[PDB]
């Protein structure tokens with residue numbers, strides 16, 4: 001017996017390819033960022049990211 | 053240090069998706085080195101910051117209570133992306149599709 005409820009940042013990107021998002025990074029400009037903005041519970045339509 | 057932005061802006065949600073990508077890449081990008089014992093040169097140097105976060109998240113014992121740089125965000129963000137499923141969620145779903153563009 002070896003139960004488990006949560007691991008460590010499983011995320012749904014373990015199937016994704018680092019090459020795919022790569023092209024998307026250059027397309028948007030994720031590899032040319034000078035100032036990384038802050039990410040804190042801002043909007044109200046995305047409050048689902050609480051996880052509290 | 054400076055304070056005055058704990059709730060961030062609404063555009064952050066937009067940056068969340070984009071950031072997730074930097075945190076998404078940085079994720080598999082940070083595990084590709086520790087899982088092989090060695091490290092390799094990365095294309096986009098932006099993943100560096102995340103590498104310091106994902107690594108900090110390991111030293112981050114509060115996670116959702118931490119406020120180190122992006123810690124709470126990297127934890128809060130990856131959190132959504134982790135618990136999020138179905139519904140009108142254009143974050144993990146589309147990023148999981150990758151059908152076109």
Ligand SMILES: [Zn+2]
Nearest residue numbers: 081094096099
């Ligand atoms: Zn990288």
Ligand SMILES: [Zn+2]
Nearest residue numbers: 112118120123
């Ligand atoms: Zn921390």
Ligand SMILES: [Zn+2]
Nearest residue numbers: 136141143144
């Ligand atoms: Zn989601």
